[PDB]
Design a binder for this molecule. Sequence first.
Ligand SMILES: O=C(O)C[C@H](NC(=O)c1cnc2[nH]ccc2c1)c1ccc(Br)cc1
Length: 164
Amino acid sequence: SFSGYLKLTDNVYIKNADIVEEAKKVKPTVVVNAANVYLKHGGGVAGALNKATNNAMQVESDDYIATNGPLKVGGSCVLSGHNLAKHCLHVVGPNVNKGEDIQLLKSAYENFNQHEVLLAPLLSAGIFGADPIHSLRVCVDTVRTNVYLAVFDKNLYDKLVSSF
Ligand SMILES: O=C(O)C[C@H](NC(=O)c1cnc2[nH]ccc2c1)c1ccc(Br)cc1
């Protein structure tokens, strides 16, 4: 049910789209959230996904952290997708603005390999401070499952396609 995606490789597809609107339309099995270790969904992709669930994602995440403690940078957990998807794979890419190791980006993308098909953003991009061109390269060289990337910014989308 994904449509209008540009094929980059055998298993990586990309589209200039708002990931919230794309999730509401497609209702995929898995939507990836650009999470932090605390599952505090304040801004960026995480804030936008949580707002679309009417804060139900935050309530569920706070119960998860109270039981399990924080995730690792490069780690993930599977929670409900609420009204946006069957499941949400919360994945923690390194946040370069908070001083985290960029080599953990490959570990973060490895979490996608546990799911046959996913709707996802580029990890560690945007407010996480990493170079999105680097993030797309690690994605294509690490994920073997079918990933549909939603890039919110039109100008960044055009730069990613032109330089791929
Ligand atoms: O989409 C991405 O590639 C990641 C990131 N997106 C958001 O922060 C983001 C924020 N608010 C949102 N409301 C609905 C979707 C949505 C996404 C981003 C990165 C670089 C630039 Br320039 C712009 C946006």
